[PDB]
Symmetry: C4
Subunit: 274 residues, 4 copies
């Protein structure tokens, strides 16, 4: 009955065109391509209907046939203009310059959206599968760790541990970290909340966390070098993914070569006295 | 006589091409489309005038008729180039490559503006219709609440309560909140200023707020997930939209299903002992 | 001999293609348009030379004449393609698809720069012409003021007063303000540094400021609503633009109408007991 | 055996299509242009295959020859449309409007990437070649300096000194600076960590730094005026590029002219009593 999925998402049901811009960036690429295509056809229909609205003014076109007009409208709106289907007199030539204004316009738009919904990057940060409470520097510290999956660095990265106990009727406690901030994050970061007299989970234990039905949330944010742009990430845990007394395994091996390396294979390994 | 509308706007009359870029992003889409269209026509007129400036150099064109030239200029600037109206000799062919440089250029521009004035997103945050001062955790706290209307989260969101009392001759007091910051805001947030000995509105009452003719302003800001981009929102209240002793109604229902839900229907409901 | 102009610029002479991107955004629009145009011509020359590099493969072209080729190259790179000058066999048709890849490419680029060097907005903030040191709330406060010239608001705006005394050999002191931050700035802001025992200019006087040959710098920054984008501004003063004992004149008139107004006409007015 | 190169890069070996967007921005321009070109050809092959998939419907084309189709597909997808190779009946004309949707689309994309991987600017900040520990204002201060190579200013710039001692097993200490922040950085900045009882390198000496095999990292960040966009920079030192007792040489000459100047020639000069 977790309020929060591992992926940081919420499990609350919400209850309730008017937000086009947002929606446009939001729909599955399948759907997006669809809509664009539809608007593409519809306008050409309109235009080709406007060419018929006057006496057929386009040359090399069958009489009253929309098939021809629609296709002239397309060749005309997309600036191919072979030269078979061609305008006639003032009326056609005007609808043409007007259609073209629209073509050029529609591109600007279509492109603007493409770019808007293209350049939203992911942090590419990995979260540890589990959380561990154990002694660090003489205090039962609760910690979790994250790693940068890419070569390029995230800079001025900051992370937030956040308890969500139940109590009445829901507490949102921002947990104090030994280090909330890292002016740069390129390999691995083990974030830790020392449990002390001000910690909410102070004196707390497993049975008491389950009783509060407490869950923990991680908010990562930073500015990715690769994108010269800001990025974020979430992840959530529950009392049943906290290894008590566990210690994370060292991810830095020294190679036979002698050169130091990072081994993301040990990233989820956790040591425990049994 | 409120200085501030509910929507956060100001009621002060201000007294006073030189700011083109701003203006361009600012005018109603109707007007914007207009201007672009105008510049579109005018240049073609210029160009078509430049084609006439030399002996008619374009083929299949009536003599001295601008109608033909203007339309050749359009087919030429928009790169349709059917092949009926076609250049001749050095002069025409040059104006052509020059016109085309301009077409391609004008698109880049037109598009750049489109995109600039397209990708300014709204926060899609709802503000509570009323403000309520009542006891919270043993102190007369003044509070108001806001909700995220979309699925996607706003992150590192922060809100500001701000008093605007009259006194001489106008005070701008930033009110201290129990929580100015939320590393994430996806459902509902009830912002609260505990009234204590440092509160400006400390000891204050309704009649005294009206006497100061005090108003309150809310500034919301955050970084929207949906847009990977920053967003803001304003809202303002007055002494006559503060329910004294009111309590906001809980917006989280637990469904018969057993799953928890958010009910924005109760968002404006406020309980009051009578 | 001011180190700093009113406009915040520096008067230090600096002593010393390798920075293309920056340069490209930096050069006068005249120059920018030029460069683009040049690259436009040069490539077409190259391409038209590549069409001649094979036997004339383009139809309706004079033999060996580059004039024809260059113009075919343009009609071809800009996708007009009338249909007079047309390709022949494998070679021409290939250079064509290759040229077109380049056309489409060059646009993307040209546009990208246009947009990059277009969407750098100005804050549109006015700085007061003079600075005044005088009593505010029982302390000789040094202050200056700025105003938002546009309707749209700047949000989370912050300002910095900064002394630049000479002493050996140059001090950079960030002056403490009564209010460094304004969660919103839509009309007028009077920024003030109370002179107290920690103020650098504490006990200081005019003759002593001139002796230190001290100057003051203002850094404004905020996030403009109009552009959904960040903006900045600078301005600098000198000891000979500080009215001692001066008071800024109130910029808010109440209209005969009864409605309150902002009068930027009084913005530079400063009252003084004589 | 430095963990960190002068350029701020790491020397850790990492151990391990699924990240297309990132990759696309990441690959050498040579490679990028390649991929785009490939996708350009492949689709045309597909389309030209779709034109053959029906009876040759394009006019002026040899039977079953893909050469013709592929080239018609290109003239058609890139909107040149000479008018030699032209469609026929419903089928061809449809694939045409469909191809064109794709052309226009592919541009939007190609461009979006171009722009994304174009507008990632460099700070253009120079780092001093060496670091020096020596007395400043009565305390052994460790300092290094950086300079703005361009005319345009970086604003709200901040720098971080960061020790990386070995100890078990690696310490990441953020060193306290006399000035971590500069609301503007246009010429030269000498950043300094006073060594006091809280300094990690307090009481430390050269032999002891080498023994800890300590290295130092500099993180620069700010918002460049030239780009109206955020920028960063890194640089790293080692115990063998710290001149003990060294003093940086003054970079500001006063010209014979009388005007003050900045001389980046002395930027790396360091004075030392011998
Ligand atoms: C040391 N750290 C855990 C603060 C953050 C990361 O530093 P790094 O190992 O990625 O360079
Ligand atoms: C708890 N809160 C009021 C601080 C902010 C919102 O948290 P959430 O309910 O949107 O996840
Ligand atoms: C009051 N202020 C001086 C802090 C800033 C501006 O407020 P406003 O008059 O622009 O709304
Ligand atoms: C003085 N400083 C070292 C803080 C930063 C730079 O100021 P400036 O010399 O670039 O104007
Ligand atoms: K075209
Ligand atoms: K064309
Ligand atoms: K044609």
């Amino acid at each position: 009955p977790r309020i929060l999925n591992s992926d940081g998402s919420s499990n609350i049901t919400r209850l309730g065109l008017d937000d086009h811009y947002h929606d446009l960036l939001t729909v599955s690429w399948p759907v997006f391509i669809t809509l664009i295509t539809g608007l593409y056809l519809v306008t050409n229909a309109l235009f080709a209907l406007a060419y018929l609205a006057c006496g057929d003014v386009i040359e090399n076109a069958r009489p009253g046939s929309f098939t021809d007009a629609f296709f002239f409208s397309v060749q005309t709106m997309a600036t191919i203009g072979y030269g078979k289907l061609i305008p006639i007199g003032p009326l056609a030539n005007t609808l043409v310059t007007l259609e073209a204004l629209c073509g050029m316009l529609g591109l600007a738009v279509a492109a603007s959206l493409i770019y808007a919904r293209f350049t939203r990057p992911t942090a590419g940060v990995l979260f540890s599968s589990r959380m561990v409470i154990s002694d660090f520097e003489g205090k039962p510290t609760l910690m979790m760790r994250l790693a940068n999956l890419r070569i390029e660095a995230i800079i001025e990265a900051d992370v937030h541990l956040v308890l969500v106990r139940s109590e009445v009727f829901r507490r949102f406690h921002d947990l104090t970290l030994t280090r909330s901030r890292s002016p740069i994050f390129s390999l691995s970061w083990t974030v830790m909340h020392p449990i002390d007299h001000h910690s909410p989970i102070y004196g707390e234990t497993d049975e008491t966390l389950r009783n509060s039905h407490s869950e923990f949330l991680v908010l990562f944010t930073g500015h990715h070098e690769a994108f010269a742009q800001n990025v974020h990430a979430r992840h959530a845990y529950s009392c049943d993914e906290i290894i008590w007394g566990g210690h994370f395994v060292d991810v830095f091996t020294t190679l036979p070569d002698g050169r130091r390396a990072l081994d993301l294979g040990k990233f989820h390994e956790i040591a425990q006295h049994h």
